[PDB]
Amino acid sequence: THKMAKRRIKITGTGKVMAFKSGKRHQNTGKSGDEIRGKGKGFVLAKAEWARMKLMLPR
Amino acid sequence: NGRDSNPKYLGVKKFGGEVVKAGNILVRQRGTKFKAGQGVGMGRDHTLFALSDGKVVFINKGKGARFISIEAAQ
Amino acid sequence: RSRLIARLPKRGFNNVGTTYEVVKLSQLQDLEDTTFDRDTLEAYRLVRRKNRPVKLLASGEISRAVTVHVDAASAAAIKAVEAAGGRVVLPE
Amino acid sequence: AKDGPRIIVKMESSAGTGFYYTTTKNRRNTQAKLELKKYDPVAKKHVVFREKK
RNA sequence: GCGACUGUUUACCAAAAUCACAGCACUCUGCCAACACGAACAGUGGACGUAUAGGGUGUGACGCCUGCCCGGUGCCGGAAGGUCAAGUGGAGCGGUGCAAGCUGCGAAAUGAAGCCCCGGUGAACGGCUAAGGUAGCGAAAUUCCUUGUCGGGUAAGUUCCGACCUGCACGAAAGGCGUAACGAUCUGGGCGCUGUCUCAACGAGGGACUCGGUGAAAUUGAAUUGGCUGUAAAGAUGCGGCCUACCCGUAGCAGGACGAAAAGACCCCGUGGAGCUUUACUAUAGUCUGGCAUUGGGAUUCGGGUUUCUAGAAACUUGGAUUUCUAACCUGAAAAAUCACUUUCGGGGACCGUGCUUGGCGGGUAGUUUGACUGGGGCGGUCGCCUCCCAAAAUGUAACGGAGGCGCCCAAAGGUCACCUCAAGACGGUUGGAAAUCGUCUGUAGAGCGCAAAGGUAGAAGGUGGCUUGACUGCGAGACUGACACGUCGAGCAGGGAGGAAACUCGGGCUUAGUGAACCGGUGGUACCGUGUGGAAGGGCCAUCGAUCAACGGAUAAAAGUUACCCCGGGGAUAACAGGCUGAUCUCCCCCGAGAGUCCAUAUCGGCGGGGAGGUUUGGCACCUC
RNA sequence: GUAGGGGAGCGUUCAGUCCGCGGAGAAGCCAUACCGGAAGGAGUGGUGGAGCCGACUGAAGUGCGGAUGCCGGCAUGAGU
RNA sequence: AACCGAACCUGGAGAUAGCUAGUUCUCCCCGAAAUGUAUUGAGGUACAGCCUCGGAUGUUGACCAUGUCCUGUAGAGCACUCACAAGGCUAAAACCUUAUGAAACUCCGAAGGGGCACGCGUUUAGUCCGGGAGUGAGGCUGCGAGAGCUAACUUCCGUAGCCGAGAGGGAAACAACCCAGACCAUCAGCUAAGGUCCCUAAAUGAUCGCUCAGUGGUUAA
RNA sequence: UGUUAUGGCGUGCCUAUUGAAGCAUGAGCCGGCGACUUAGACCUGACGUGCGAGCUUAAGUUGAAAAACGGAGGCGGAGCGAAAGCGAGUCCGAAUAGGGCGGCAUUAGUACGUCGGGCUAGACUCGAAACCAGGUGAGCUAAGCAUGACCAGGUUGAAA
RNA sequence: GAAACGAUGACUGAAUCCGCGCGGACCACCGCGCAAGGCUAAAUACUCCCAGUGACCGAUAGCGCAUAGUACCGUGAGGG
RNA sequence: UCAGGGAACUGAAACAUCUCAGUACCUGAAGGAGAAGAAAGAGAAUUCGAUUCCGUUAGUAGCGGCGAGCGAACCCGGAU
Ligand SMILES: [Mg+2]
Ligand SMILES: [Mg+2]
Ligand SMILES: [Mg+2]
Ligand SMILES: [Mg+2]
Ligand SMILES: [Mg+2]
Ligand SMILES: [Mg+2]
Ligand SMILES: [Mg+2]
Ligand SMILES: [Mg+2]
Ligand SMILES: [Mg+2]
Ligand SMILES: [Mg+2]
Ligand SMILES: [Mg+2]
Ligand SMILES: [Mg+2]
Ligand SMILES: [Mg+2]
Ligand SMILES: [Mg+2]
Ligand SMILES: [Mg+2]
Ligand SMILES: [Mg+2]
Ligand SMILES: [Mg+2]
Ligand SMILES: [Mg+2]
Ligand SMILES: [Mg+2]
Ligand SMILES: [Mg+2]
Ligand SMILES: [Mg+2]
Ligand SMILES: [Mg+2]
């Protein structure tokens, strides 16, 4: 469904799923330094199986 | 009263004579119960972890002081 | 709604512009004739898709004489077309 | 991390010519006038930062 | 007792102490009236009425009367100022193009009702901190304690009448206190008379019964359908053991078949419903208000402008207030009733209405919101985070289980470097004589660590000065932990740093609490997108800002109540009745013997304690039955 | 062995193809002591008065005891 | 217009229904769940856990032994903390002798438990990827606790086992208890728990005693 | 085979459940009706067929006891990123740390069919109280209006 | 929303050929285009009716009707 | 078929914007069909050339409590 497109459910070559890290996006910061670049790359696929069902056609 | 308290964790994560890898977290402790021997580093929360690969060795002093070290495997 | 789809922190920016048709060197060299491709033969050469311009990149590495007319190509692809001799044309 | 009218504050940052944000909570309690420290900007880094704004 | 009264009402459980009522009061309305029906500047009702009229409101014959409190709310009246919408006005900022120019945004001043503000009004909502009960009444249709206390009546009077007053919570037009008469009203009492009764009897008729004619119903898993005691989902004909009992009917009885009837109406559950309510949310009829339109003229005041003879004036004048006119428009009269007409006109008149927009008011209407946990629900309490106990020598682990803490602080309590070592007692010392400051003696710490507690700490994390911004940017080998998303620890590589002579150490603080996903926006930086192209608007990326979203994985940007008029979907998942298990409390028995019994514990009596029984008490529990 | 997953199959209607049967009697209906691991299927007998098995493949309005389920018929209460 | 806190008829409309009922032909092979976390969440949804099918891997599973480490319970103990029993001593306290209590005390401290390696030895499942799920209300007993009254066919966890979804024998009857897991046939044999006087199968058995109460076959001070 | 006498054994079915012979639900009896579908060039899997580094067509056109034609388009064929862009590399950053990925030691597709699921529609069948639109009703009852009709007999005895 | 353009209810109401609208705030350039006048077969939708067909029904099916909007219910709309 | 007027249940697991949907309903006009039509256009090639219709682009570009959900057009292939 049209939300997950520009937001990352993103699919890879292996048909795996990219979300990364939410730790603090915009409001509520001012704590440490590696939490901030702690904005990440990483995901589990347990909830990928039903994830990309939303992104299915325009992956 | 109704304050359900907390989960915490602790425990000793890698036991004696276990082959660990460089970066393995060895013990989760509160203060320093187990003290860092040769091969072993200690973080903020007083966690003990491994700087190299090898057999894990426990050192006991009569309690009151303890140690964890790493004997190389190779 | 709220099961780990929202609560997930992305924006990015959507564009998805010009997309080139991939033509492997590995295809062009090795087999066939070096038929002097241009944009003509691509129809029958099993590179026929269209809708988009055509682009050449290096994949398989082999020496041959070849001359290819595409819309654009990569650096090492240029290098590999010239190293075994040849040319790659581009419009202005 | 909660914020309001109260003492201390969450303080903002800038430098001579360098454009950068440290964002360290200052404290108006004992002493706040100069928020000045040494912080390292976009390129040359290695310079003085005025967190007084 | 209640209402005064005839009356009126719940077609089908309520006729009344309800409604009405004559009488009284507040207030509204000057007449195309207020007001009401209405797509409507049509029409109509008010009313072919017009202020001893017309609407609304509350009390309720008559009699005596009706008190204190304008703080809050409403309502009227006020006016110095405070705040406020479009709008007239337009300093400035910006894009674009060579430029004239075209264009994004935009304040000061000026701008209406209203609102804060002053005052007043209670037969306005009201109340007995704005004041606190005038008369009258008071164990009342009001009184909890309560069968109040005396009295009356009765052989005996929890009711009744009378007094008193301590009025749990009477009281003056949501009227107070009385009142002759009235009442299928209501309460107590007498007389009379009686089958109401002691206590039933006899008689009649019409059904019940029998015979001939016609001949249904609700119910129905199938039945070949006993008693006791026990067991079973906890109340057995259908299980067990024991007793009983030949087959089939008729008239009768209602104990059982948890007998029939109605998917319980009580209760709880449903992110069910509907009626109502209001200072819940939101809109809106309606209504008020500024500007614009129909919509015009002249005198007169005031800001200004362009034209021109010596700071004056003439003036095409443009706007604002008053005044006034009249051809728009409204509206009445005259032979022609609604109209159209000519008129003398009459009056109103640029208002009013009406149209577009502006701000206010707006339960009159309208759509909805009104968490969960919960030994039923409610009320109380509890919702996230940290610590110990529970926790059964790994991790882990519930309860409306046992105790306490967090939502910060620290520009130094941090990085590094260097030195220092605490609590307490004994002895002896001048502001002392429990405790000061100084002194020697012991002193694995019996101290300390910003805060809770546990762990940790004597080779320091404790106490101190030196220099300082590692409270850095770019990253992360490998692991702890979680369903997920979060969370935690970390060697080492680089750019660059800080302390040390040095090995080296530092990417916040002895650690474990000091927290907020997403979305939408604010600020700085980078220049990726930028719609014919070159820009710019807007977007994107790296920082950052706004959350008692505290019901703390967070429902919308925006939300309180009531139903006994209630409706639907379900629950014996879950209260109230009864049973059931339990036996705390309840009933009862026993053991001991302290003393009372003049003397003698045990004739009787049994403190302080102890051990059982019973299942009649108030309960616990939620097991069958919603 | 309950929800749940997997495998083999039985039956009914229509359809194409194949084999066919029927007035010396079709389908249906009725009785039955046989066959088959079950869904089931034969044999003979009795009714019936027009049509119909079997094999192979295909397509389903395809299999009932319950739903206070729907229509219909007929019981109980009762010669009350 | 015989049922008005919003009439009746048609229509939107097969409104919606986290709720209740119902869900039909056969044999075969497996086989659960009522736990954890989040929830305007609590009788409901998502993810995990547990089931099945298929592919791959192919002993990595399983028990049990050896070796190695981690632990602070049972117990016990008083050395700290809180409590407390008689005495000595001396301006209450400290202190000595004697003596105890502890979930939130600990100088100590098992049995057991968990990780790892290994197979000295027996076994025979595990893991990964992919398709379809259902269950997310549990019940009883023994053991270890909290609540409660050291009450309850209570309630809330931990732990085994059974019922759940388990027939068969036993305990009269009797989900859980004892014994034992039903592929099919038989008028064949051995046993378990339980039993062996008659109602029912099987010693009115053997030896040495005890009890005279029907104790047996209603509890105590 | 039918019936029977005696013996032994023996707690209807269904649902709902921790637990049912249940004094819990349902149902008088027999017949017939009666509930997990259908649709889309959707998505994802299992099996099967055809071609296969390629595989298919859609609308339509032409024949139509018949099917052929139709390459518009779709899927493979390259990944990485916020994108510009770049490319067996791409990203973040001032080059070396990593995410994604190609190489793999090697993993081919596409079209059609049946089936296992998913999504959108009633979506297994039956069942609401309610909500909205347009109409029908005052021949019942609540009132108004216009116009008619009706109240044996007796008692009481006001103003003037 | 940065909201262009079409469309109007109210108030305003410019040019016309070196002119005029557009190209998604806006400007220049560049490019398409001539509003404020009308008409206009065919490809398209539907089935009261007629025809032909069917892995459509065959008497609880198929429309409700093997003809009936009849009987029948309702004041009626309506149902049947 | 065009037009004047214009619902709610429902969905968002509550509910206001949204969704239902310009759906249902009412109304007006008309024919066998209607509507629509002869670029102040689409659009980025200095391409195209009235309208409608089908396939397709394409669940794309986009709109959205950026929630539920909503969803084009140009090119291109055909009918005409
Ligand atoms: Mg009266
Ligand atoms: Mg009545
Ligand atoms: Mg009555
Ligand atoms: Mg009787
Ligand atoms: Mg009954
Ligand atoms: Mg019910
Ligand atoms: Mg009732
Ligand atoms: Mg480091
Ligand atoms: Mg949102
Ligand atoms: Mg919100
Ligand atoms: Mg009442
Ligand atoms: Mg009870
Ligand atoms: Mg059934
Ligand atoms: Mg009888
Ligand atoms: Mg009789
Ligand atoms: Mg009625
Ligand atoms: Mg329905
Ligand atoms: Mg399946
Ligand atoms: Mg229990
Ligand atoms: Mg069950
Ligand atoms: Mg609604
Ligand atoms: Mg909803």
Short mmCIF file of N, CA and C (backbone and C1' of nucleotides) in Angstrom, two decimals, chain J residues 13-57:
data_model
loop_
_atom_site.label_atom_id
_atom_site.label_comp_id
_atom_site.label_asym_id
_atom_site.label_seq_id
_atom_site.Cartn_x
_atom_site.Cartn_y
_atom_site.Cartn_z
P A J 13 -7.75 1.35 11.45
"O5'" A J 13 -8.89 1.25 12.56
"C5'" A J 13 -9.10 0.05 13.29
"C4'" A J 13 -10.51 -0.44 13.13
"C3'" A J 13 -11.52 0.05 14.18
"O3'" A J 13 -12.74 0.41 13.56
"C1'" A J 13 -11.57 -2.31 14.04
P A J 14 -13.26 1.93 13.63
"O5'" A J 14 -13.27 2.26 15.19
"C5'" A J 14 -14.18 1.61 16.08
"C4'" A J 14 -14.74 2.56 17.10
"C3'" A J 14 -15.21 3.90 16.57
"O3'" A J 14 -16.51 3.83 16.00
"C1'" A J 14 -13.85 4.28 18.44
P C J 15 -16.92 4.72 14.73
"O5'" C J 15 -16.45 6.19 15.11
"C5'" C J 15 -17.26 7.00 15.95
"C4'" C J 15 -16.82 8.43 15.87
"C3'" C J 15 -16.77 9.00 14.46
"O3'" C J 15 -18.02 9.51 14.05
"C1'" C J 15 -14.70 9.39 15.52
P A J 16 -18.18 10.18 12.60
"O5'" A J 16 -17.53 11.60 12.76
"C5'" A J 16 -16.64 12.06 11.77
"C4'" A J 16 -16.65 13.55 11.75
"C3'" A J 16 -15.57 14.17 10.88
"O3'" A J 16 -16.12 15.29 10.20
"C1'" A J 16 -15.28 14.83 13.16
P U J 17 -16.67 15.08 8.70
"O5'" U J 17 -15.41 15.51 7.82
"C5'" U J 17 -14.70 16.70 8.13
"C4'" U J 17 -13.34 16.74 7.48
"C3'" U J 17 -13.19 15.99 6.17
"O3'" U J 17 -13.70 16.74 5.08
"C1'" U J 17 -11.31 15.58 7.57
P C J 18 -14.31 15.99 3.80
"O5'" C J 18 -13.74 14.52 3.90
"C5'" C J 18 -13.48 13.78 2.72
"C4'" C J 18 -12.34 12.82 2.92
"C3'" C J 18 -12.64 11.40 2.49
"O3'" C J 18 -12.50 11.21 1.10
"C1'" C J 18 -11.71 11.37 4.65
P U J 19 -13.80 10.84 0.25
"O5'" U J 19 -14.05 9.32 0.65
"C5'" U J 19 -12.96 8.41 0.60
"C4'" U J 19 -13.33 7.09 1.20
"C3'" U J 19 -14.62 6.48 0.70
"O3'" U J 19 -14.47 5.83 -0.55
"C1'" U J 19 -14.55 6.36 3.05
P C J 20 -15.32 6.31 -1.83
"O5'" C J 20 -16.79 5.81 -1.49
"C5'" C J 20 -17.12 4.44 -1.63
"C4'" C J 20 -17.94 3.92 -0.48
"C3'" C J 20 -19.44 3.97 -0.65
"O3'" C J 20 -19.91 2.85 -1.38
"C1'" C J 20 -18.86 4.78 1.49
P A J 21 -20.22 2.93 -2.96
"O5'" A J 21 -19.73 4.36 -3.42
"C5'" A J 21 -19.64 4.63 -4.80
"C4'" A J 21 -19.84 6.08 -5.11
"C3'" A J 21 -18.60 6.97 -4.95
"O3'" A J 21 -18.67 7.95 -5.98
"C1'" A J 21 -20.36 7.82 -3.64
P G J 22 -17.38 8.77 -6.47
"O5'" G J 22 -18.03 10.17 -6.88
"C5'" G J 22 -19.07 10.26 -7.86
"C4'" G J 22 -20.47 10.10 -7.29
"C3'" G J 22 -21.60 10.06 -8.34
"O3'" G J 22 -22.63 9.16 -7.92
"C1'" G J 22 -21.99 11.82 -6.83
P U J 23 -23.86 8.83 -8.91
"O5'" U J 23 -24.30 7.35 -8.52
"C5'" U J 23 -23.38 6.26 -8.60
"C4'" U J 23 -23.59 5.30 -7.45
"C3'" U J 23 -25.02 5.17 -6.98
"O3'" U J 23 -25.75 4.25 -7.75
"C1'" U J 23 -23.60 5.52 -5.12
P A J 24 -27.08 4.74 -8.50
"O5'" A J 24 -28.21 4.61 -7.38
"C5'" A J 24 -28.44 3.37 -6.73
"C4'" A J 24 -29.15 3.54 -5.42
"C3'" A J 24 -30.45 4.33 -5.44
"O3'" A J 24 -31.57 3.61 -5.92
"C1'" A J 24 -29.13 5.06 -3.63
P C J 25 -32.53 4.26 -7.05
"O5'" C J 25 -33.40 5.31 -6.25
"C5'" C J 25 -34.06 4.96 -5.04
"C4'" C J 25 -34.51 6.20 -4.33
"C3'" C J 25 -35.12 7.25 -5.23
"O3'" C J 25 -36.49 7.00 -5.50
"C1'" C J 25 -33.49 8.26 -3.88
P C J 26 -37.10 7.36 -6.94
"O5'" C J 26 -37.35 8.92 -6.83
"C5'" C J 26 -38.09 9.42 -5.74
"C4'" C J 26 -38.06 10.92 -5.73
"C3'" C J 26 -38.30 11.56 -7.08
"O3'" C J 26 -39.67 11.63 -7.42
"C1'" C J 26 -36.45 12.57 -6.04
P U J 27 -40.13 11.63 -8.96
"O5'" U J 27 -39.55 13.00 -9.53
"C5'" U J 27 -40.00 14.24 -9.00
"C4'" U J 27 -39.12 15.38 -9.45
"C3'" U J 27 -39.00 15.57 -10.94
"O3'" U J 27 -40.11 16.23 -11.51
"C1'" U J 27 -36.86 15.68 -9.99
P G J 28 -40.65 15.77 -12.94
"O5'" G J 28 -39.73 16.59 -13.95
"C5'" G J 28 -39.67 18.00 -13.87
"C4'" G J 28 -38.62 18.55 -14.79
"C3'" G J 28 -38.61 17.97 -16.19
"O3'" G J 28 -39.58 18.55 -17.04
"C1'" G J 28 -36.42 17.95 -15.33
P A J 29 -40.38 17.63 -18.10
"O5'" A J 29 -39.42 17.64 -19.37
"C5'" A J 29 -38.73 18.81 -19.76
"C4'" A J 29 -37.55 18.49 -20.64
"C3'" A J 29 -37.77 17.39 -21.67
"O3'" A J 29 -38.47 17.85 -22.81
"C1'" A J 29 -35.70 17.05 -20.59
P A J 30 -39.50 16.87 -23.57
"O5'" A J 30 -38.54 15.82 -24.30
"C5'" A J 30 -37.71 16.25 -25.36
"C4'" A J 30 -36.71 15.20 -25.80
"C3'" A J 30 -37.26 13.89 -26.33
"O3'" A J 30 -37.78 14.00 -27.64
"C1'" A J 30 -35.35 13.50 -24.98
P G J 31 -38.70 12.83 -28.25
"O5'" G J 31 -37.66 11.83 -28.95
"C5'" G J 31 -36.67 12.29 -29.87
"C4'" G J 31 -35.49 11.33 -29.94
"C3'" G J 31 -35.81 9.92 -30.41
"O3'" G J 31 -35.91 9.81 -31.81
"C1'" G J 31 -34.44 9.82 -28.48
P G J 32 -36.71 8.58 -32.45
"O5'" G J 32 -35.76 7.32 -32.20
"C5'" G J 32 -34.55 7.19 -32.92
"C4'" G J 32 -33.58 6.25 -32.24
"C3'" G J 32 -33.55 4.82 -32.78
"O3'" G J 32 -32.21 4.32 -32.72
"C1'" G J 32 -33.99 4.77 -30.48
P A J 33 -31.11 4.72 -33.82
"O5'" A J 33 -29.77 4.80 -32.96
"C5'" A J 33 -29.42 5.98 -32.25
"C4'" A J 33 -30.24 6.16 -30.99
"C3'" A J 33 -30.02 7.46 -30.24
"O3'" A J 33 -30.76 8.52 -30.81
"C1'" A J 33 -30.01 5.65 -28.71
P G J 34 -30.22 10.03 -30.71
"O5'" G J 34 -30.45 10.41 -29.19
"C5'" G J 34 -29.65 11.40 -28.57
"C4'" G J 34 -29.35 11.03 -27.14
"C3'" G J 34 -28.19 11.78 -26.52
"O3'" G J 34 -28.55 13.08 -26.09
"C1'" G J 34 -27.96 9.49 -26.05
P A J 35 -27.97 14.37 -26.87
"O5'" A J 35 -26.66 14.75 -26.05
"C5'" A J 35 -26.70 14.81 -24.64
"C4'" A J 35 -25.54 14.06 -24.03
"C3'" A J 35 -24.17 14.65 -24.30
"O3'" A J 35 -23.88 15.76 -23.47
"C1'" A J 35 -24.11 12.31 -24.63
P A J 36 -23.49 17.17 -24.12
"O5'" A J 36 -22.11 16.87 -24.87
"C5'" A J 36 -21.00 16.36 -24.14
"C4'" A J 36 -19.94 15.81 -25.05
"C3'" A J 36 -19.50 16.69 -26.21
"O3'" A J 36 -18.58 17.69 -25.81
"C1'" A J 36 -19.78 14.46 -26.96
P G J 37 -18.52 19.10 -26.58
"O5'" G J 37 -17.94 18.72 -28.00
"C5'" G J 37 -16.64 18.15 -28.14
"C4'" G J 37 -16.27 18.00 -29.59
"C3'" G J 37 -16.61 19.19 -30.46
"O3'" G J 37 -15.60 20.18 -30.40
"C1'" G J 37 -17.38 17.20 -31.50
P A J 38 -15.87 21.70 -30.87
"O5'" A J 38 -14.83 21.89 -32.05
"C5'" A J 38 -13.68 21.04 -32.14
"C4'" A J 38 -13.17 20.97 -33.55
"C3'" A J 38 -13.46 22.21 -34.40
"O3'" A J 38 -12.36 22.47 -35.26
"C1'" A J 38 -14.32 20.30 -35.46
P A J 39 -11.39 23.72 -34.97
"O5'" A J 39 -10.85 23.44 -33.50
"C5'" A J 39 -10.02 24.38 -32.83
"C4'" A J 39 -9.86 24.00 -31.37
"C3'" A J 39 -9.07 24.99 -30.51
"O3'" A J 39 -9.56 24.94 -29.16
"C1'" A J 39 -8.02 22.89 -30.45
P A J 40 -10.88 25.74 -28.69
"O5'" A J 40 -10.33 27.14 -28.19
"C5'" A J 40 -9.54 27.24 -27.01
"C4'" A J 40 -8.23 27.92 -27.29
"C3'" A J 40 -7.19 27.84 -26.19
"O3'" A J 40 -6.50 26.60 -26.22
"C1'" A J 40 -7.30 30.06 -27.03
P G J 41 -5.24 26.32 -25.27
"O5'" G J 41 -5.37 24.78 -24.91
"C5'" G J 41 -6.61 24.23 -24.49
"C4'" G J 41 -6.75 22.78 -24.90
"C3'" G J 41 -5.59 21.88 -24.51
"O3'" G J 41 -5.66 21.45 -23.17
"C1'" G J 41 -6.17 21.50 -26.77
P A J 42 -4.34 21.43 -22.27
"O5'" A J 42 -3.65 20.04 -22.65
"C5'" A J 42 -4.32 18.82 -22.38
"C4'" A J 42 -3.96 17.71 -23.35
"C3'" A J 42 -2.56 17.14 -23.24
"O3'" A J 42 -2.40 16.24 -22.16
"C1'" A J 42 -3.10 17.49 -25.51
P G J 43 -1.21 16.46 -21.11
"O5'" G J 43 0.09 16.59 -22.02
"C5'" G J 43 0.56 15.49 -22.80
"C4'" G J 43 1.66 15.89 -23.77
"C3'" G J 43 2.96 16.39 -23.15
"O3'" G J 43 3.82 15.33 -22.77
"C1'" G J 43 2.30 17.84 -24.91
P A J 44 5.18 15.61 -21.97
"O5'" A J 44 6.20 16.12 -23.08
"C5'" A J 44 6.84 15.24 -24.00
"C4'" A J 44 7.76 16.01 -24.92
"C3'" A J 44 9.13 16.32 -24.33
"O3'" A J 44 10.08 16.53 -25.40
"C1'" A J 44 7.94 18.33 -24.63
P A J 45 10.95 15.34 -26.04
"O5'" A J 45 11.32 15.90 -27.48
"C5'" A J 45 11.83 15.05 -28.49
"C4'" A J 45 11.04 15.16 -29.78
"C3'" A J 45 10.99 16.52 -30.45
"O3'" A J 45 12.17 16.90 -31.12
"C1'" A J 45 8.83 15.61 -30.44
P U J 46 12.63 18.44 -31.08
"O5'" U J 46 11.27 19.26 -31.22
"C5'" U J 46 10.72 19.56 -32.50
"C4'" U J 46 9.84 20.78 -32.44
"C3'" U J 46 9.11 21.13 -33.73
"O3'" U J 46 7.93 20.36 -33.91
"C1'" U J 46 10.08 23.08 -32.79
P U J 47 7.83 19.27 -35.08
"O5'" U J 47 7.07 18.04 -34.42
"C5'" U J 47 7.26 16.73 -34.91
"C4'" U J 47 6.55 15.72 -34.05
"C3'" U J 47 5.06 15.56 -34.31
"O3'" U J 47 4.75 14.75 -35.43
"C1'" U J 47 5.40 15.80 -32.01
P C J 48 3.54 15.17 -36.39
"O5'" C J 48 2.23 15.01 -35.49
"C5'" C J 48 1.75 13.73 -35.08
"C4'" C J 48 0.70 13.84 -33.99
"C3'" C J 48 -0.68 14.33 -34.41
"O3'" C J 48 -1.50 13.28 -34.89
"C1'" C J 48 0.04 15.53 -32.51
P G J 49 -1.77 13.09 -36.46
"O5'" G J 49 -2.96 14.09 -36.78
"C5'" G J 49 -4.28 13.78 -36.40
"C4'" G J 49 -4.74 14.71 -35.32
"C3'" G J 49 -5.96 15.56 -35.65
"O3'" G J 49 -7.17 14.88 -35.34
"C1'" G J 49 -4.22 16.94 -34.85
P A J 50 -8.61 15.44 -35.79
"O5'" A J 50 -8.94 16.56 -34.71
"C5'" A J 50 -9.23 16.21 -33.37
"C4'" A J 50 -10.48 16.90 -32.90
"C3'" A J 50 -11.31 16.12 -31.89
"O3'" A J 50 -10.85 16.28 -30.56
"C1'" A J 50 -12.71 16.86 -33.63
P U J 51 -10.54 14.99 -29.65
"O5'" U J 51 -11.99 14.45 -29.26
"C5'" U J 51 -12.96 15.33 -28.71
"C4'" U J 51 -14.36 14.78 -28.84
"C3'" U J 51 -14.61 13.43 -28.19
"O3'" U J 51 -14.80 13.53 -26.79
"C1'" U J 51 -15.59 13.48 -30.35
P U J 52 -14.04 12.52 -25.81
"O5'" U J 52 -14.90 11.18 -25.91
"C5'" U J 52 -16.29 11.21 -25.63
"C4'" U J 52 -17.00 10.02 -26.23
"C3'" U J 52 -16.46 8.66 -25.84
"O3'" U J 52 -16.89 8.24 -24.56
"C1'" U J 52 -16.89 8.72 -28.17
P C J 53 -15.90 7.40 -23.62
"O5'" C J 53 -15.83 5.98 -24.33
"C5'" C J 53 -17.01 5.25 -24.59
"C4'" C J 53 -16.74 4.06 -25.48
"C3'" C J 53 -15.53 3.22 -25.11
"O3'" C J 53 -15.77 2.36 -24.02
"C1'" C J 53 -15.54 3.59 -27.44
P C J 54 -14.62 2.17 -22.91
"O5'" C J 54 -13.79 0.92 -23.43
"C5'" C J 54 -14.46 -0.28 -23.78
"C4'" C J 54 -13.59 -1.15 -24.64
"C3'" C J 54 -12.19 -1.41 -24.11
"O3'" C J 54 -12.14 -2.39 -23.09
"C1'" C J 54 -12.05 -0.78 -26.37
P G J 55 -11.19 -2.13 -21.81
"O5'" G J 55 -9.76 -2.60 -22.32
"C5'" G J 55 -9.60 -3.88 -22.92
"C4'" G J 55 -8.34 -3.96 -23.76
"C3'" G J 55 -7.03 -3.62 -23.08
"O3'" G J 55 -6.54 -4.68 -22.27
"C1'" G J 55 -7.10 -2.65 -25.24
P U J 56 -5.88 -4.36 -20.84
"O5'" U J 56 -4.68 -3.36 -21.19
"C5'" U J 56 -3.50 -3.83 -21.83
"C4'" U J 56 -2.65 -2.70 -22.36
"C3'" U J 56 -1.95 -1.84 -21.33
"O3'" U J 56 -0.75 -2.44 -20.86
"C1'" U J 56 -2.92 -0.47 -23.01
P U J 57 -0.43 -2.46 -19.29
"O5'" U J 57 0.18 -1.02 -19.00
"C5'" U J 57 1.51 -0.69 -19.37
"C4'" U J 57 1.62 0.74 -19.84
"C3'" U J 57 1.77 1.79 -18.75
"O3'" U J 57 3.13 1.95 -18.37
"C1'" U J 57 0.12 2.47 -20.35
#
